[PDB]
Structure formats: C-alpha cells, structure tokens
Design a protein around this motif. Structure first.
Motif, mmCIF file in Angstrom:
data_model
loop_
_atom_site.group_PDB
_atom_site.id
_atom_site.type_symbol
_atom_site.label_atom_id
_atom_site.label_comp_id
_atom_site.label_asym_id
_atom_site.label_seq_id
_atom_site.Cartn_x
_atom_site.Cartn_y
_atom_site.Cartn_z
ATOM 1 N N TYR A 203 10.078 20.430 -136.479
ATOM 2 C CA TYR A 203 10.616 19.716 -135.335
ATOM 3 C C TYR A 203 11.320 18.405 -135.639
ATOM 4 O O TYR A 203 12.220 18.009 -134.902
ATOM 5 N N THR A 698 1.709 18.727 -135.492
ATOM 6 C CA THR A 698 3.142 18.935 -135.611
ATOM 7 C C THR A 698 3.798 18.301 -136.825
ATOM 8 O O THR A 698 3.708 17.090 -137.042
ATOM 9 N N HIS B 666 0.309 25.116 -124.642
ATOM 10 C CA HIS B 666 1.641 25.691 -124.762
ATOM 11 C C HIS B 666 1.648 27.014 -125.537
ATOM 12 O O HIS B 666 0.937 27.163 -126.537
ATOM 13 N N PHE B 675 8.180 25.611 -127.541
ATOM 14 C CA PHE B 675 6.971 24.973 -128.043
ATOM 15 C C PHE B 675 7.348 23.584 -128.551
ATOM 16 O O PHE B 675 6.541 22.648 -128.506
ATOM 17 N N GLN B 676 8.584 23.475 -129.038
ATOM 18 C CA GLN B 676 9.139 22.219 -129.539
ATOM 19 C C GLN B 676 8.798 21.047 -128.617
ATOM 20 O O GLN B 676 8.416 19.978 -129.081
ATOM 21 N N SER B 678 6.251 20.481 -126.616
ATOM 22 C CA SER B 678 4.872 20.010 -126.763
ATOM 23 C C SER B 678 4.620 19.501 -128.180
ATOM 24 O O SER B 678 3.787 18.618 -128.386
ATOM 25 N N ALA B 679 5.334 20.069 -129.150
ATOM 26 C CA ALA B 679 5.180 19.668 -130.535
ATOM 27 C C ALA B 679 5.575 18.208 -130.655
ATOM 28 O O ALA B 679 4.951 17.450 -131.396
ATOM 29 N N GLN B 680 6.610 17.812 -129.921
ATOM 30 C CA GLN B 680 7.065 16.424 -129.958
ATOM 31 C C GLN B 680 6.111 15.512 -129.187
ATOM 32 O O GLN B 680 5.955 14.346 -129.537
ATOM 33 N N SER B 682 2.730 15.948 -128.862
ATOM 34 C CA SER B 682 1.577 15.758 -129.728
ATOM 35 C C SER B 682 1.895 14.784 -130.867
ATOM 36 O O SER B 682 1.083 13.910 -131.197
#
Ligand SMILES: CS(=O)(=O)c1cccc(-c2cc(N3C[C@H](c4cc(F)c(F)cc4F)[C@@H](N)C3)ncn2)c1
Lengths: 726, 726
Positions: A203, A698, B666, B675-676, B678-680, B682
């Motif tokens: 990401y 992440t 997610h 998903f990106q 929520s990845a950001q 977190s």
C-alpha cells in the motif's frame, strides 16, 4: 521495593546493553568505532589512536550508515542511501575516500542502486554488483571492468543470491568469493526463469492512489527451483577492451542427474577452491576440490578429491553442510560432520583420502570451528557441565587430540557460560564475548599463553541501573521424557515463591535445530511479563531441537508438526505439575515456526492451554519455500511425502479452536511467510464457526520490526495475555 | 415472559418473513412461482392453474437457479451454472424449453459463460452477450446473429457495463435496450482501454499453492474514465451472411467537449428513443430524443428536442438523472426533477418545448413514477402525514392536477405506512406491497375503481410465532436543528422504561440521499441487540439525507465528511439528553459509507462515543471510484476540490482514536471499497501508537455475505459491543 521492568522500558529501551564491536585489521590491531570517530587499538598494550575524526564527513551531504575500510587501510568505502530489501539484501550508494591523499574520489564512482560491494582480501580491489551484473575495480579511481552481461532483474542473478538462496542457503545476498590474495574472483549465477512468483499488495504512503503489486520469484514446496552455475575469473587477466573470461566449474555428475543446490564455497589456497553441492533431496552432498590449471587456464576438480557427506536419519548439516577449514598447504582440512553416534564433531581429512579422522568425540557437539593455526584448532562447543545451552571456547592440539584445553569455562563460571569469539588475523589475539547468564562481558586475550590482557566492556553502567529494579530470574534445567533429558528455561518473576501458583506463558519456536533453552542474558518482552505482570515465561527444547545429537534433532524428519508440537504440550503438562503453576492459566505464543507450533498446539484439542498468540505462522508446508520445507519434509508428491504434507496443516484442526482464545497476527507485506498462510487459517476458522482475535500489520514483513509496528504489536499482545490471565 | 429475539434467530433465520413475488405476463394474469412449480393466476377472480410442474425438470441434470418466460408464453429460458461477478453481473449457462412441443431445444444453444440474456419485449427473440459481444436469436432453435466484433475482455464491452457503470450509473450489468415491439435493439459500448487497474490477491481454496492476483479496470477519483458509444441495430434487417450494421448515435456537442457519461436510455415509441448524457462534472445533463429516419436508415436527434437538466446547488438527480415516462404518442413525457424550491416533483414536457409544467408540488417528494395511462399518472411519494420516511401510492388526473388520490394511505394506517407497487401490463390491476411498520402485507387491486380484490399474503404465520417472543419496538420521530427538523428512529428493547438508562448504539450510513429513519419493518442484528441485550439502536438522517428537498441533501455538496458526520455526533448528543440513555455507554457502527462516517466520528475527538465498529469503510476519497466520488466531490485537483479531498480522510484523524475503542473490519477481496482503504487506516493508527481491534475476512467482498462469513462477522461484532457496554 523500587520499580519493575515495564513494557515501556522494553519498547523504549531504557536499559541499554553495552557492546564492544571491534574489527581486526591485522594480527595486532583492531578498529573500534564510536558514536563519532573510529579509533585503532594496539591489542598488546591497549593504547589507541584516532583512525579518522567524526568531523571528517561533516559536509559529505549524505547520512552515512556504514563504512568499510580496505584491508589496505588505504581506502574507506562509504555507504549511504540504504534501502533494505529482504532479510540480508539491500541497495545503496557508495563513495570511496582516499585515506592517503585524504581526498574523496570523484571519478568512475560506483553506481547508485548497487546491490553489493566487497573489497578483495588484501589489496584495495573492489568487486560490486549492479543491475544483477558483476563489476571489478582494480583501483578505486579507475574505470570498472564488466564481468558479466546476462544480468536480468528477477531472472538472472550474477554475484548475488535470489530470494530463496539468500534466505535458505547462504544467509547472505552476496554470491561472490575472492581468492586469498585477491587474484581470483569466484561467483555463482542463479536462474529464476521458470520459478513461480508470489504476488502481494503493498500500500505504501497514504498518497499512493493505487496499491502496487509486488512479485518475487519464490519456489514454494515442490515447485520449480532456480538453477545455478559457478564461475571463476582471473582479475589479473582483464584488459579494458576484451570481455572478461569466466571459467565455469560444473557437475559433479551425481548432482547433475537432477535438481541440486550450491551450498558452500570455500577457498583452500591461492589456486585451490572447494565447493559443496546438495541434491534437492538434501540427503546427499558432494564436495569438489578444484585446482587452477596453469597452462590451460581452466579449473579441474579431480574426482578422488571429492568427498561425499550423506545422512540416513535425516538431512545433511544443521541447516546446510558445514564449511571446511583448510591447513596452510590446502592439502588437508577440518570440518564438522555428524558422528556414527549422531553427534556433530570435528573430522580431519586428507584432500585425497576418503575416510576422515574424528579429533573430538562425546555426547555433546562442536558448534563451530573458529580458528586454525599450524599449532591448534580453536572451536566452540557445549561440552562444559554437559549443558547443551552453554557455549565455550576450546583449543585442541593438532599433534595430540588428547590435549584439549577450555579457554573460557573458568574465566567467570557464575556470570559466563555462553561465549562467542573473534580472533585477530593470525589468531595472535582474540576477544571473548560472554552473553550470559550474567551481564555481557567483553575481554581481550593473547593466544601464546591464553593470558587475559584486559576487560573491554563489563556493562557496569547497566549493572548500577538494574539494582534499582525488581528484575526476574532465570532457571535453566531439564526434565526426563522416556530415557532422554530435555532442557527448558523459565523467566521467573521477582521474589518467586514456589508456594504460590503463577500463570504461565509457553514462549515457543521449536523449529528443527532450534534452541530456546540457554544461558543467554536477555532484556525482552518476557522480562516485562515476569517482572511487572508476575507471569512465568517458559521455553522447552523437545524432539527436533538442536545441538544434542541427531537422535533428537532428526526425530521429526519427514514429520514436521508432530513430535515437536507434542513435546511442547507435554512440557506444559509437566510444568503445571511442579506446584507453582496455575493450570487454569497456561498460555502459549510463538513467531514464525513458533507461530505454526503455537497454532498446532492450540488446535490439538489437548485442553492444556487457555489462550495463545501466533505471529506470522506457517499454516501448511506447501505454502513455504522449497529449500527449507523440503529439507525436512521431502517432496509433496504421492510418491514421496504428500500425505504428511496434507496431515500437518493448521486449518485441518480448525474445529479444536472452539476450546481456546486465539490471537492471529500477520504482516501484509510478508515476503517470507506469506500473508496467505494466515488468510487460510482465518478462513478455516470462520468456516467452522470459531471466534478468535486477529490483527494485520499493513506493509510490515516477517519481522514486523518497524519502530511503530514493533511497539504496537507487543502492546496489543500484552493486553491479550493480561486479559486471558486476569 | 417467554424468550427474546436472539443472535441465533437472526443468523439462522428462525422467524421467516413471507413474501408474494409475482410476475405479470399480461394485463389480466400473473405468474406466481412456488418452491416446486409455477402457477398462473387470474387477477380478476383469483383462480389459478399450473403453468408448469416442478417435476418437469427432474432429470435436467443441472440445478436451475432461475427461469425466464418469453413474453410469448411460448418459451422458458432456464438459467444454471450461475457464477456471480460483481454486485449485479454474473455468468451462467442457458437452455431454452419449448412450452409448445414441450421439448428441450438442443440445437444452436446459447453458449456457456454467457454474460447476459434478455427476451425481446413481445415475441420470443433473444439477445445475449458472450465474450463481450452481442448476439441476437430471432428464433430459439435458429443460429445466432453476431452483432458486434470488438468485444475484448477488460477492454471493450458491448451490451454490458464495465465495473463502474454497473455499480454507479446503471445498477445493472445489462447495457442493451430492446425497442417496444422488439424491432430495434439499442446498446452501449464501453472502452476501458486506458482505465487503471485495481489489483488484489484472491486466495481461493486451500489447495491453491500460489495466490491469484485479480485485476479489474477501476477508475479511482480523478483517474482516466472509460469512454462510451451508443448504437441501434434493426434486428429485422439481418441476413446470415452480412455483418449486421449498427447505427451510432453520438454527441451532444455540449457533452463531447469533455469527459461525460451515458446515464439513461428510454424508448419513447417504436421509432423514437431518448438518451440522457451527463458531464463528468455531474452538474449538467442533456437529454436527446432521436427518431428513426425511414428512407435513410440512420437516427436523428433534433436539437430543439433536447432538454437540459442542471443543478446550481449540487449534482443532477438523486444518484443519476431520473427516467422519462412518455405518453402513448411519444410526443410528451413526465419526469421527476428538482423544484425551484429544491423538492423533487413530476414535471410535464412537450418533447419540442423547453419549459415543463410541474403537476405536483409541496414540501415532500415524489419517489418515483410507477405507471402512466392515458387517464392517470401513478406515483409513490412521502407526502402523507408529512413523514419523509413513509411511502404511499397516489394517482393524479392528467386532465386536472387538482385531483390527486391516495390509493394506499388509508388501507391500514396502523400497520402500513411504507408501500411499493407492481402494475399489470396496462395497469388494469396492481399489487400493493406494505413493508411496515407492521408485518408485511401483500394485496391485489383493480385500477378501474381502486377496489381491493383480496389479500395475497398477510404473514399471519410469522405473527403467531412472534407473539411468543419479547420483540423490541420502533420509535420514529424527529428533533430540531436550527429551524429544520431531522428524523431518527430507535429500536427500543422490550418493556422499554423511559425511567431506566440504556446503552445506545448509533447505527449509521449517512451517505448522500440516504435514509436510515423510516417506517419499514425489519428483523436484523438491531432486533437482537434490543430484544436480547437491551441496547437501544438509533439511526439519524441529518444533512445530506435524501427525500427531503435539496437544501438538506445538497448541504454536503463538495463537502463529504463534514456536516453529515457532525450531525451524527449532534444527534447522539441530543439522544444522551432524552433521559433514558447512559451517556457513558454510547457506541456507533456502520458499513460502507457508514464505515467512513463511523471512523470520522470516532476520530473527531468529540468524546461522545466510547467505542465503534467500521466495516469496509472508505478512508479517503481518492481511493474510491470516479463516478460516485466526483459526483459529490468534484475533481481532486488544486484547481477544483483537492484541498477538501485531503482534509476529509480518516487517517488524518488517527491521533484522536486514542480516546476510543475501535474495531476495523474488511474483506480482502473487496472489489468495491478496496482493502487498501482499511490498510491505510490501520497503518496511520499504528504510526500514531493507537491500539485497536481488527478483523480481515479472507476472500470476502464488500458484502461479506457468504453464509459462514456473515454469521462470523455479526458474532464477532456482538462480542465487541457487549464487552464495550458490559
Ligand atoms: C435508484 S437508481 O436511479 O436506479 C440508481 C442508479 C445507480 C446507482 C444507484 C445507487 C447507488 C448507491 N451507491 C452506494 C455505493 C457505495 C458507497 C460507499 F460510500 C461505499 F463505501 C460502498 C458503496 F457500495 C456506491 N458504490 C453506489 N447507493 C444507492 N443507489 C441508484
């Protein structure tokens, strides 16, 4: 009394361990870097001088994260713009500083994004890898000589290892080896052409609109492996107009018949190099000793000079076949091999004689050969007090194997039972590094009489600090499972009261040839858990453990996920019966292989454990890389070991997780143990209706070691354990 | 008293709602499928007959998930091998059954992996899409006619929508429109050639050794959009040797000047079709009315016949410009547009006259036009009792707009305040569908006098069952924020005691034109939370909400993430002041847009909320698709609205999460909200040192609706809420 060792102390490193990292540049001097400048020390007297001031590079204009002084003492290689890749690999920019004219070399400089750089053993020659090709520089300011042209990203690697070779066989990115005097440069070439790619998302910073897909050649169990070739080039026979000539060394025939690996290269003399090859079925290894043919230019490896090393009980070597240590004339060598009794000891070979002579023996093992003089052989073993978790330096008389002397055992038996050593160029002096059970102690000694010259660092500062805090204690002992003894260690809370019943956390790894029970001093999460939370943190070395002979280590051969997890359960079962353990509060946690074991234990349906944490666990062996997995599991085919491959997964035990509290953690950018492994675990748990806790990190890899992620995962895990125990 | 509505009841669906899904095949008959066989009903008398026995396909050899009877009554299209794609799209295999000769057609059958199939409006012609190309079948057993040849996976779509058009503009996969009598087949073509791809991993079954990387053309905010073209082909002028000729309808000039979209196609007559285009800046839309030129073969769209629909306060339409409803002669039409007062009402147009005449007006809105006879116009609105959360069927006399009659208001005002309707072919009969506040009620009526013919389904079975369980109650009311009233609803626990202080959960969505406060009857997670856990579950419709006029809906124009989240906080603030709320236990949760709002609220630093759950939330608008995001946010450029794009992210508020308990959920295979996002979230929380809970759902998309994942996420969320409240 005062305070305890808190989580913040651990995460913020309030109690720092002092080290004494020195770098020998001769047989009499060593360089001792400092926060600011590098000093040069005289081993004999201890007097020092400044090798180069910190200010020297005030206006270099770049942050220098590492230096490298040519064995010449003439030049300094400055590394900056560091960008980490995998566990060992990384890229950086380099500048050479002339210590003679005190000038920064600005012509024909090393390219940016260089993958690896190394000085020759003696002069000031340079060999580096850029864009997967090798380049040699005879003089720092002179133009480079291209050695290879096949370099191709993710496909062909010259002088550097691909992903699996870096992680599984060489534990390094570098795949090039200079000869003793620097005349020859040997190197390996890896071809990943048909190796499947593992793909996962990265990401990056919030500003990246579309995630990027990372893809790396990674051979999972039973997949197509990369192939390898070996070459040797004479760095003295290169023009500037002629494309260099690399002479390839092939075979052996016993290896070429199928898939194989290059697992070791060690120069014997100026014109003799040894190579060890391993079959994909890491049961059989072959060593070739090759000589440079003067009036022919090629290299010949006389059969008759090759030595076979195989195993009937397991794989060869602890992780890979041991390296040989040649005598001055390169006509004989010493190398650690497994006994007829299953114990690893030093065997003496004549390069052209099939059978070797063991110079050491007993129910203990030689950890490694550290130095070899014409007079003695210095090695580290766990023989002392019969405790396999201890390490000591020993020297054995080559003239009479009867004369073995322990050089560290008695120095300070209370504080020091775990040593590592660092010898000067000709082993005239050596530094001893004590790392436990007491505070780390670094000392200097002279080999002539093994006289202690002086203490280098005794961590007295840390000692004063720790006497104001309630520190936990460590118990190293063993239990007895049907005839054999298995060691364990327990981090005990301050003021331990064998009368009280404490909650227990089984800290586990348990991989093949692992050791979690030793005499090493540590300040980690377990320290906090015991000191502040009064939790006992134990670790057990069961079947599969290392440094205790093959009967124990090879027990899990072709059977991963069986005895090693069972013994872990059995250990907890015995701990909860020692009287000071609340069997209602027994937990278990582990990382990597320990995550796998933790998961297998929690899904065993033993009922012994209330809760558990698995961090970046392997869930099924067909998901992990070929070199590591196959070494212990063979091939995942019905003709070989597929059935056990299918019987040792975590998901197959999903149902049993209904009886426990499980916390699953995994970094999304794990290039080693792919997030895929935990993704499949969670899915099997959901499909069976089992509730559990989870946490993804992440862009973190297998180490989840970035500063923020590190503090965050240990903080998250502390809450989980306390909740389970309180 | 007895039991409460449990989580298991919700997850296992122990209390089933009965429906009465019928399909009109004429102006007098309708088909009413059953578990086994399909019956045909006579609307006038109610007598029925079997249209086709369940046994009919005992040995079809395939599981049939859907049928489709040609308007002819002559054939039955059997759908099987269903494989879902996105929200609407999917592929399947089809077989045609001849109801005449009662034979299964085996020649020239529809290909497998067919993307879409549809009968013509009248006969039994077939039009289907396979491999992105269009095919027409004049007779079920005859060879197909290829209509297009440019079809190309992920690049060129003929007759079907690409990802963004399916989800954001047409709410369908189908992109083809038959003319009234079936003569012409119109269709759109989408070009995704330069649209960036979103890539993410799909793990699949445990046996997949290497994860697969899914890539789909998806334009994120401000990225390159797909282009579109429109064509019309005469399905009566096709040979079997000549490649069909599609006549393209281009422009309008006002659209071609830049990026634009095709947002609606509606046939007016047998030879007249209307098209609505929207500029990328969804401020301006244009409708073209085109006629088939007999002795020319092409289609002409006379300017002067085109109608502009724009907005100065926001975007055009609720989600997209409304569809027109043409009079028999296609010379005039009715369509819902925004008032001069900002309320959506029915406006009457003369195809060649610029200004239209509003036939309805008031501080309420027409939800939709349901039927149009030469006599009346039937529509659904929320005028009754002035409650915007209610729906009723009305008919207005075309001869005198003064005469509007409510057809559902008084049928049963206690049990029914939310209706939807289904008219027969010529609106001779209609079925009313009451969905709340009481149990759903389905009835039949005849349009001539609006006489109630009979009750179709009254859910009496469910009624008997529910009287043995302590069910929660629903309160629909409003509060007053500076002059304006904003509605809310609360799912109250059984035996509600305004004297007691209950914990409260704010169930939120809050997207533009959303409505979470209505009179609809529901059996969901909230039912369980209130009935069994005694938690009050409230929902509030603040600024940005729909069906209340543009002053409210357009309030968040170009300002997403502001007033709509603020009002949600303000609502909770007022709820905790009504006297029956424990302000120490106020939580908030939402999915999709509601996840974004939930996160923005939790990161607002208001302190009002103790905990919150965000499921598949958007975290920053530049990550979501162009069509939806840009509609409310404009372009993410410094010249347009970039600053607010950067000011409305969740991660920018990471620090404020230190004051709350957050659960982030997610699905890893979310093709909609990547998903990106929520990845950001977190990552920003970790970087700031904020602890929180997380849960990923491997291979689940935006719906996380697979049976196992569904039960698992609601079970996980129940534990979280209870822990926060208990
Ligand atoms: C009546 S209509 O005219 O037929 C017609 C036509 C065309 C679209 C509609 C429509 C579209 C819609 N959405 C909401 C949705 C969404 C928003 C988020 F914030 C998310 F995180 C995830 C999402 F899925 C987005 N993907 C589209 N919601 C309601 N109605 C309605």
């Amino acid at each position: 009394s005062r305070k305890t060792y808190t989580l913040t102390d651990y995460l913020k490193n309030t109690y720092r361990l002092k080290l004494y990292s020195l770098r020998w540049i001769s047989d009499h001097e060593y360089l001792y870097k400092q926060e600011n400048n590098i000093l040069v020390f005289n081993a004999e007297y201890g007097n020092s001088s400044v090798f180069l001031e910190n200010s020297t590079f005030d206006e270099f204009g770049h942050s220098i994260n590492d230096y490298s002084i040519s064995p010449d003492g003439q030049f300094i290689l400055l590394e900056y713009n560091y960008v980490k890749q995998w566990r060992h690999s990384y890229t950086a920019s380099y500048d050479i500083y002339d210590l003679n004219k005190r000038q920064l070399i600005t012509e024909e400089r090393i390219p940016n994004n260089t993958q690896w750089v190394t000085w020759s053993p003696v002069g000031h020659k340079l060999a580096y890898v850029w864009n997967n090709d090798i380049y040699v520089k005879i003089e720092p300011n002179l133009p480079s000589y291209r050695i290879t042209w096949t370099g191709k990203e993710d496909i062909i690697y010259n002088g550097i290892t691909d992903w699996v070779y870096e992680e599984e066989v060489f534990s390094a990115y570098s795949a090039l080896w200079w000869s003793p005097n620097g005349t020859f440069l040997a190197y390996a070439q890896f071809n990943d052409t048909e190796v499947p790619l593992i793909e996962y998302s990265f990401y990056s910073d919030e500003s990246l609109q579309y995630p990027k897909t990372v893809r790396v050649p990674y051979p999972k169990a039973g997949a197509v492996n990369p192939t390898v070739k070996f070459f040797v080039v004479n760095t003295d026979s290169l023009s500037s107009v002629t494309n260099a000539t690399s002479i390839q060394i092939t075979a052996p025939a016993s290896m070429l018949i199928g898939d194989h690996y290059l697992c070791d290269v060690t120069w014997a003399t100026q014109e003799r190099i040894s190579l060890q090859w391993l079959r994909r079925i890491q049961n059989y290894s072959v060593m070739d000793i090759c000589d440079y043919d003067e009036s022919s230019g090629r290299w010949n490896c006389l059969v008759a000079r090759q030595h076979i090393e195989m195993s009937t009980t397991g794989w060869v070597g602890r992780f890979r076949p041991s390296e040989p240590h040649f005598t001055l004339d390169g006509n004989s060598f010493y190398k650690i091999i497994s006994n007829e009794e299953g114990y690893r000891h030093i065997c003496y070979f004549q390069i052209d004689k099939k059978d070797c002579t063991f110079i050491t023996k007993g129910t203990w093992e030689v950890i490694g050969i550290e130095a070899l003089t014409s007079d003695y052989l210095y090695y580290i073993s766990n023989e002392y007090k019969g405790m396999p978790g201890g390490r000591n330096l020993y020297k054995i008389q080559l003239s009479d194997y009867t004369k073995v002397t322990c050089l560290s055992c008695e120095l300070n038996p209370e504080r020091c039972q775990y040593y590592s050593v660092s010898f000067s160029k000709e082993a005239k002096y050596y530094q001893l590094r004590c790392s436990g059970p007491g505070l780390p102690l670094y000392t200097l000694h002279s080999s002539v009489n093994d006289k202690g010259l002086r203490v280098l660092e005794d961590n007295s500062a840390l000692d004063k600090m720790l006497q104001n805090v309630q520190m936990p204690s460590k118990k190293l002992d063993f239990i007895i499972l049907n005839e054999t003894k298995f060691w364990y260690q327990m981090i005990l809370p301050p003021h331990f009261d064998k009368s009280k019943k404490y909650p227990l956390l089984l800290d586990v790894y348990a991989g093949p040839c692992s050791q979690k029970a030793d005499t090493v001093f540590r300040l980690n999460w377990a320290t906090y858990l015991a000191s502040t939370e009064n939790i006992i943190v134990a670790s057990f070395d069961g079947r599969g453990s290392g440094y205790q002979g093959d009967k124990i280590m090879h027990a899990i051969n072709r059977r991963l996920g069986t005895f090693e997890v069972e013994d872990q359960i059995e250990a907890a079962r015995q701990f909860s019966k020692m009287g000071f353990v609340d069997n209602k509060r027994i937990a278990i946690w582990g990382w990597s292989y320990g995550g796998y074991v933790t998961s297998m234990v929690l899904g065993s349906g033993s009922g012994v454990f209330k809760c558990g944490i698995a961090v970046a666990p392997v869930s099924r062996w067909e998901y992990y890389d070929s070199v590591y997995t196959e070494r212990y599991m063979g091939l995942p085919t019905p003709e070989d070991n597929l059935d056990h491959y299918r019987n040792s997964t975590v998901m197959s035990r999903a149902e049993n997780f209904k009886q426990v509290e499980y916390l699953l953690i995994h970094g999304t950018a794990d290039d080693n143990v792919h997030f895929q492994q935990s993704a499949q675990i969670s899915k099997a748990l959901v499909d069976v209706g089992v509730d559990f806790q989870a946490m993804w990190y992440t862009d973190e890899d297998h180490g989840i070691a970035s500063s923020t992620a590190h503090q965050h995962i240990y903080t998250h895990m502390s809450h989980f354990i306390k909740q389970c125990f309180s």
